[PDB]
Amino acid sequence: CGYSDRVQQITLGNSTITTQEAANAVVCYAEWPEYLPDVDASDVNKTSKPDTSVCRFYTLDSKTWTTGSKGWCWKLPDALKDMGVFGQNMFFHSLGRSGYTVHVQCNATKFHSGCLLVVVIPEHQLASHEGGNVSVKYTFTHPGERGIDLSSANEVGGPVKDVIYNMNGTLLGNLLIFPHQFINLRTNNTATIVIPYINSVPIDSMTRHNNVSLMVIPIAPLTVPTGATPSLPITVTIAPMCTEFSGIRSKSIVPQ
């Protein structure tokens, strides 16, 4: 009985991702993403299913993991609003529903040390740094493909950037309850998380609401060998999956 498990590949549309140091992919709540059934539907407009034209992997700009980096946060579907036909359909339709296959990549040598916690939080409602009853402005919660850097300073009307309190008042060690995977450089170069549609409604506005928030947080800090650059590149790859759009209308207007 001779075989290996570290080698797996995912092909979506015309894009293919290959791996040689992978940990078993995670499927949130053991439920694979699926189309909205007639027994749960509310809006009567027949849904547009674009299949291979939108269901493919999009690479987000790489981030640089330094020894002093606090972590990174992305909001979905906001992070894909400028990505090809998915980005246009998401603004041309009033309502949308979609699952996602998230694939995070961080490769390093056999001498490097460090561990990332890659976790998906549904309704990751952020706290403002000002406390009291202050709200987070739309422009800071919807950054797009450049995401939120938790290493940066706080901003007026912006969310809080203390990673340990998860930007919402919970501790970092408890994030393991949400679908997560670790990129331990000693064991793995890639985390993978398949997310179904998570909402209290069957289909919803894609411009006003983010269903999930992806967080990549270094737990054990980056430890490079003596004489190597104290920095490592992180690339995030996301593919919409089992996507549904409804209520076509003139292009949606958002701030900035």
Partner: protein, 273 residues
């Protein structure tokens, strides 16, 4: 049902205690996998840990004081405490809020129990027989403006009348627009640069107005009305990381600046017991 199985010596090439937590799976390793054990039974079902039991006991959600006095020489009857309004939400008390906010979506039938208690801080010769009116104002209905407003007639709005000192209790079906309540919402009311985040009509159950329907007397009686909520037929989805820091507002996830450390620092090094 067996809790621990009978298990003897182990000499094998299959090692259940070694794994890769990097996979995001917490392996179901048992006591019998690390050492040799005897057969014992669970002899317990776990009924007190059901989500229906953890959320299904009463807790106070609002406390308010109302007064029986003449309305002559007053411009605002709510500021005179002649009647009081409550924006219905379960996020005012931290003991209940943390239990309920441990899940992302919850769908339950409510059961309200209202306790009104009288007090005479000023001179009174007898214990007045006051009757309190609790009126439910769903979103869109006219909220009372005066203690003797036409709105209190309640031709269609649900209303309950009870004697002060006693209690009233009424059940309420699931009133949310969606299939479950949203405990958290990573979104806005509309696509706008200055609109409200999280707090939105998704968490708007309506309002409750409270008055003393009895006419005003010669003595002032302060009545503290206490609303208790108990959930029935509870369902919960997407378990969440528990709240650690104190709260600052209803329906928002904010915490105070300069907050105290939540990790209880140990006395001595990492090796002390």
């Amino acid at each position: 049902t067996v809790a621990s199985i009978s298990s003897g010596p182990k000499h094998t090439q299959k090692v259940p205690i070694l794994t890769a937590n990097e996979t995001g799976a917490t392996m179901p390793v048992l006591p019998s996998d690390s050492i040799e054990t005897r057969t014992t039974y669970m002899h317990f079902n776990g009924s007190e840990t059901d989500v229906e039991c953890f959320l299904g006991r009463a807790a106070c959600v609002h406390v308010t004081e109302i007064q029986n006095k003449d309305a002559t020489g007053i411009d605002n009857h709510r500021e005179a405490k002649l009647f009081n309004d409550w924006k219905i939400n379960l996020s005012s008390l931290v003991q209940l809020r943390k239990k309920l906010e441990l899940f992302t979506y919850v769908r339950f039938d409510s059961e309200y129990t209202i306790l009104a208690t009288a007090s005479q801080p000023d001179s009174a010769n007898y214990s007045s027989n006051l009757v309190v009116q609790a009126m439910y104002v769903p979103p869109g209905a006219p909220n009372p403006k005066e203690w003797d407003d036409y709105t209190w007639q309640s031709a269609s709005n649900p209303s309950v009348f009870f004697k002060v000192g006693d209690t009233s209790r009424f059940s309420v079906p699931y009133v949310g627009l969606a299939s479950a309540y949203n405990c958290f919402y990573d979104g806005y009311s509309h696509d706008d640069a200055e609109t409200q985040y999280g707090i939105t009509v998704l968490n708007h159950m309506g309002s409750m107005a409270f008055r003393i329907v009895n006419e005003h007397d010669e003595h002032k009686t302060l009545v503290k009305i206490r609303v208790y909520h108990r959930a029935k037929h509870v369902e919960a989805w997407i378990p969440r990381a528990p709240r650690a820091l104190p709260y600052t507002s209803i329906g928002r996830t904010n915490y105070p600046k300069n907050t105290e450390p939540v990790i209880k620092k140990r006395k001595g090094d990492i090796k002390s017991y």
